[model samples]
Target chain A: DKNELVQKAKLAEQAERYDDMAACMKSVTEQGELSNEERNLLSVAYKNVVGARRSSWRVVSSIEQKTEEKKQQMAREYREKIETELRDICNDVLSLLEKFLIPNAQAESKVFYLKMKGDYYRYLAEVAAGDDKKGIVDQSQQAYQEAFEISKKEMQPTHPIRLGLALNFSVFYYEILNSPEKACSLAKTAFDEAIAELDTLSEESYKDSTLIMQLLRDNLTLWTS
Target chain B: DRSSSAPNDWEIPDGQITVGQRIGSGSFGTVYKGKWHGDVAVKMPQQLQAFKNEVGVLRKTRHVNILLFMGYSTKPQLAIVTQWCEGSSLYHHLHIIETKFEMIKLIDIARQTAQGMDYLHAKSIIHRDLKSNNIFLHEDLTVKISILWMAPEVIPYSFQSDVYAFGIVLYELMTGQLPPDLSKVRSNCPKAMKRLMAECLKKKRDERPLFPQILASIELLARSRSASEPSLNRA
Candidate 1:
């Protein structure tokens, strides 16, 4: 009888009939003189089925939200006028950097730019979208360099905060400016800065700085070497 | 001369055990293709300690994208039955097939996987071994994580490590590379994914993203990708 229930459960499971498989397993627990091990297995299996179904539902909802957000952001971009829109975007980015660059605000400023570099890159993206590639790249180079200078002066040379700025600047050089050499040079600076900071950092921070430094070194080697 | 108490009667029918092929092997166990009622993967343990730890950790946690633990055997052999992921490991999908839809599909996979990790971390369950091999992809682009017990018990408590692991998985999806020997990948890969992966792999647990922040950043990546390439399709 116990074997028969196990067979039914297996059959249901094979057919992707999880509910039935779970039910059969449950029945085995109630009817069969199950050992402690059998009971434990049944409990785990029951939990898994229920969890799988519930988690699947959550994942679906997350995917939907992601899709909708993407569509909406695209639509927002489409509705904006191109040239003025691009300049406005760039201005907004610069202004955002300004907030973090004010003297004592250097550390926060460095962190802020590191986070916003992706969005700033998007601004240049919009400019490039308007067929102003030269303008976008040229303007971005100055803006990024200026941000790097401020970070260098304010933060410790080897601070991860400082390294992050240099790393972000390297992206601008490599991706937008099409200067892998320049990117490598900047990346080396970031790596060196991170390595310097390594000794003084907390055990965890030290690990992080070392990882970042290695990554920068690797990027330089891959792109230029 | 092993004691036979009918081995606790945790019966997996013989007919249902049609072994297909080996899909993956890991530190904890080897996963084989088998039909459990429908289709299932039989994860046979390599070490007793690892199996026991995984069973204990999995029993308490639940999340989508996580591998579902079916019944286990403690009798003649120890095995974990789980849903058969039709898509196989993201590693095989990326390296073996080299599918054209790799980038977007990978992004989707990363997002879903992040959501699952987010759920686990929210419940304070740390997946110490978060990597490409552990993340199984479904044909539908849905991901089912495997190898629950690869990380020791202590690591999961620091949900940050899970975040760090998610970072590596994200890097894998983007670059189609395994977790780069940290020495090499940091410098070679393009800045975008590299930076994000670096953030995830941050050595300090405190520096690593919290689950909520990780989910938000992943969503941000999805948003950025969509914004950049408006015509890309989402599966």
Candidate 2:
């Protein structure tokens, strides 16, 4: 039964063996002998394992980014510079990325990553200037399309990591990029993927699935029309 | 835990003592009824420091809703002397018994409460804890607010904090349910009041409403409520 698999997954998850937990969930889903309830439970457990893994990776990435920034700042300061001078170094690095790196990358992929990166920086600058940079709206359409392409090509459509990324990107487009229509479109895609992924989770994990869906749906409506 | 002589040396005179049945008990001590001189109700403090802080505050304050100080014992046991209300605390009436009061009686309670808050705010003394249990109602329907557990001066008074507590009292009277842990009961209140109470109980102290303004809003609500209004009667 899926309950046995769920119990196994729970034990695996509790022991911090997330990969094993995910495997158990997948086995339950593919095993074919489980009832609808067992299937549901398996689906939820799988989703939770996926979600937890994604969250852990995000935290790790965030910490790594911060550590790198700190190291950069320290290095700049140690090389004979004041606080303002250190800030200038950081700005110059960002400017170099903007002026040289992004444009070079944009020509290779129709993704418009450079335009999105430029818009993102411009949005940051506007925020620092105490002004709303609603001007970033134009960049979101291309960003969503590029993200969708990457999501489709690299990850399973219903993969939790891909779904979460799509959802996050949609939220950014709607809230920060100020492109509601494109945001809503991307959000719809994310919502479908998230729900599909949720269907592959265990019963306990499904508890928060409906809540997450409702939240996404509400935000989607708020931005859409 | 301290010397027994500490409390024994602080007993009030026999004439001043009119001990009624014990009202309530908590982690600190028990509160009992007594007659102070001619007043109807007197609260004898079981804790030494509690007795001193209550007496000190009562000596400085003079308000109709605030319990009046009569005297204290310095001979047998530490006791606080105060005007005894003929009627019990709102907590007893609302909780200990099933009898429900009329809407007008409820409004009267709210009005007297707001007046007490107004008085406290004017004196820049935030009650800090304003619950139904601390509010004593007289036989004539007049209110007497008590500070049973006096917080030390180290904690600065924020009027919004008091307002936050006052909202709980108002909510208690309205819903007949005592304040549970706020996080659990947040969704129970009407949308508007829930939002306001949420603001009042904001983790950041700076986000709470000023007491005077809170009192004004409560007074306005009390004034506008009609006796026959169904809204007043519904919890």
Instruction: Give the per-residue Cα lDDT of candidate 1 at A186.
Output: 69
lDDT of 1 by residue, B83-126 (tens): 67776566677667765554556567667777777777667666
- Candidate 1 interface RMSD value: 24.3
Model 1 chain A: weakest 10-residue lDDT segment is A97-106
DockQ for all candidate structures vs. native: 0.01, 0.00
Query: On residues A1-225, what C-alpha lDDT tens digit does candidate 1 reach at each position?
Result: 777777776666567676676667656645523443444354345435534533443444355456655665654444333335435534543453344233223354444444344435533453354465665565556666666777666766555545656776776666556688787776776676566666684766776566556556556666653
- Regions more than 4 Å wrong, model 2: A1-225, B1-27, B36-39, B45-50, B104-108, B146-157, B178-204, B225-235
Q: What is the lDDT of residue B32 in candidate 2?
A: 68
For model 2, what is the C-alpha lDDT against the true structure?
Answer: 0.54
Interface RMSD of candidate 2, in Å, is: 29.0
TM-score of each: 0.39, 0.37
